[PDB]
From Swiss-Prot:
It catalyses: Hydrolysis of (1->4)-beta-linkages between N-acetylmuramic acid and N-acetyl-D-glucosamine residues in a peptidoglycan and between N-acetyl-D-glucosamine residues in chitodextrins. Keywords: Antimicrobial, Bacteriolytic enzyme, Cytolysis, Glycosidase, Host cell lysis by virus, Host cytoplasm, Hydrolase, Viral release from host cell. The active site is at E11, D20. The keyword Isomerase does not apply. It comes from Enterobacteria phage T4 (Bacteriophage T4). It is an enzyme of class 3 (hydrolase). Changing D20C: Nearly no effet on specific enzymatic activity. HAMAP family: ENDOLYSIN_T4. The gene is E. This is Endolysin.
Amino acid sequence: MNIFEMLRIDEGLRLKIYKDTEGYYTIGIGHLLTKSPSLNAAKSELDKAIGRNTNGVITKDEAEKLFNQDVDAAVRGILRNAKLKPVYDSLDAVRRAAAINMVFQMGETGVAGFTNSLRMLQQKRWDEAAVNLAKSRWYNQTPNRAKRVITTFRTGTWDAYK
Ligand SMILES: [Cl-]
Ligand SMILES: [Cl-]
Ligand SMILES: [Kr]
Ligand SMILES: [Kr]
Ligand SMILES: [Kr]
């Protein structure tokens, strides 16, 4: 297991524009296109991201290309964020994949808002952090995915994905 395989399980792969769990236009492996309710706007952003007139449809390869860019951006976002970097650097490799997952889902900002949990993770208080992490809109809205990520921080193993 690794970060790619992990997010590929949590996000799925769809070659035509679809709405995600929040009703926003997305494509591929969880690539958010726009929060706008306009399909045309979505189609606009997709073409711009791909570099061709796609007509709302992309290939497997193109999806994978966006995904790689998205994972890279997520990592870079963490490393550049002053509240996140220290936590991430204190973690082992598995737990770091959990942190990248959360960032890919909710954005750096979002994650940077879990103050209390960030601190517990940094102190290595796993059980305590897992309980605090569950007290969130994130967990109530996508509970099965949240449970998988939380178990990953809790145990430091890939069992929830096995
Ligand atoms: Cl892009
Ligand atoms: Cl879920
Ligand atoms: Kr983090
Ligand atoms: Kr995190
Ligand atoms: Kr977090």
